[PDB]
């Protein structure tokens with residue numbers, strides 16, 4: 001058997017825009033995901049977050065599912081424009097009320113809330129003022145975070161400033177595949193830098209307002225392997241750029257990673273080091289998301305291309321490489337030694353079907369999760385201070401530019417009826433949580 005530490009936090013995760021629907025209900029302002037998805041051509045099948053899983057109405061039911069599964073922690077995000085419809089200034093009590101009910105319910109049911117302050121749904125009003133490209137967002141984000149802390153910090157004690165700031169910056173502002181849908185490398189690197197400044201300002205406000213809780217930040221990570229000797233530097237660059245070092249080198253060491261500076265120095269503000277002392281504001285934990293591995297080789301035509309491997313893949317076409325989760329956990333301890341780590345997302349999209357027996361037989365997803373949980377266990381045996389693990393996601397949901405076409409839930413959602421059907425993977429996970437680990 002593989003038993004986890006006493007009190008290890010088994011969780012599930014969601015994000016506001018992906019599950020809630022009702023984006024303009026009760027005085028909410030538009031987000032950049034509302035306006036991005038309502039722009040033709042941006043999202044597969046013209047899908048939007050208008051209805052999603054209708055969690056805005058079905059939240060009590062969904063939490064009852066978490067409870068019934070015995071899951072111990074719920075990572076969810078707050079929609080900024082539900083709270084401050086113009087991004088700064090006016091606070092919307094109905095927005096606070098929505099999350100207050102969720103928080104109180106979780107606590108009543110003995111489930112630990114982990115709140116993601118920013119999970120990509122920037123108020124559209126702030127995008128008009130440049131959004132993450134504008135240095136003043138450190139102020140706007142600080143003011144937003146302060147509202148959350150003042151209203152919820154008496155009850156919520158575990159906070160995450162930003163979800164995947166690499167994606168926010170690069171996918172949103174260089175690739176243009178996510179909101180706000182821009183393709184400018186100078187903007188994208190100013191967004192990187194402003195994300196860090198905003199994160200640090202929020203941590204600073206947190207220390208002034210919630211003297212009893214913990215705060216961290218969540219990064220996407222891939223397991224990059226070289227296509228050979230030589231290539232190994234291509235791997236070094238992808239790790240430094242795409243993984244936690246882009247942000248943790250500033251936080252812990254006060255500068256960007258060496259190979260990021262080699263590639264991107266000219267795109268960063270001329271005097272960006274002036275902000276590094278503030279960026280080093282102390283954090284309580286590091287959240288790592290992990291899903292996939294990539295074979296990487298140097299390619300002269302960022303000087304990196306991916307090499308497709310004949311490995312099992314998910315419906316995203318992502319290679320399944322469970323040892324990657326062990327690697328990234330080892331590597332983060334070795335590089336920055338954060339006092340606590342969480343796996344804040346791990347999961348898989350498969351072509352789920354409801355069988356004639358009314359069940360969803362996702363053995364592929366069970367196998368995926370089991371292998372990664374096993375590799376995480378290993379890291380713990382070797383001294384990584386991993387305190388919890390969160391499955392992405394509780395529910396099938398709006399998967400950004402792929403729309404509803406990609407199902408990551410351990411619970412199936414029939415969008416025609418909003419019916420929830422717990423998948424075999426959800427039942428399997430509940431048993432893992434109950435046993436505090438693998439093989440009964």
Ligand SMILES: O[C@H]1[C@H](O)[C@@H](O)CN2CC[C@H](O)[C@H]12
Pocket residue numbers: 015018163164289291345392399400
């Ligand atoms: O739905 C998104 C989520 O909002 C992000 O935090 C990153 N994720 C990685 C896998 C899947 O793309 C999931």
